[PDB]
Amino acid sequence: MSKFFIDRPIFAWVIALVIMLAGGLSILSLPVNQYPAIAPPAIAVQVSYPG
Amino acid sequence: DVSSAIQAQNVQISSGQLGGLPAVKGQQLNATIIGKTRLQTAEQFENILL
């Protein structure tokens, strides 16, 4: 592989540019948040029985 | 008559709060007032007058 790219440095560049272009564009869809969803899910059940 | 009666004398009455909101200026002492809860013993049932 390496020997192959050593005499084909544009090809090498292109796989690199494709990687960048794609991963770059990915930053325009990733949501941003402080921490990931780390709290255990919980369910509350609630009833008022007046008096 | 017995059902209507049983319903009448075996019913948790809500009974509010003693100092609820709004209140008169001051007061300072608020407390829940617990009424009676429903009957429990066979004997209490034997007594619900008709």
Side-chain angles (χ1 to χ4, degrees):
Chain A
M1 200 168 70
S2 297
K3 293 192 163 95
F4 171 85
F5 289 120
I6 289 173
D7 300 302
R8 299 172 217 274
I10 288 169
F11 200 152
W13 267 119
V14 180
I15 91 120
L17 287 171
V18 173
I19 287 172
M20 282 191 285
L21 178 66
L25 286 154
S26 319
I27 300 167
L28 299 179
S29 72
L30 266 24
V32 182
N33 39 273
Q34 188 183 24
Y35 286 101
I38 104 180
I43 302 289
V45 194
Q46 282 168 329
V47 177
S48 58
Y49 178 17
Chain B
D1 299 290
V2 192
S3 195
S4 291
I6 299 155
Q7 287 165 252
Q9 301 178 77
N10 184 64
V11 45
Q12 190 191 115
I13 56 164
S14 211
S15 319
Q17 265 202 316
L18 194 57
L21 295 173
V24 305
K25 181 154 138 64
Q27 173 64 293
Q28 295 189 331
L29 288 69
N30 163 231
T32 65
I33 78 201
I34 164 174
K36 198 180 283 187
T37 64
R38 297 140 292 202
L39 310 188
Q40 298 196 234
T41 61
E43 314 298 60
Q44 282 157 292
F45 275 99
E46 292 189 313
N47 222 102
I48 52 196
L49 290 183
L50 282 45

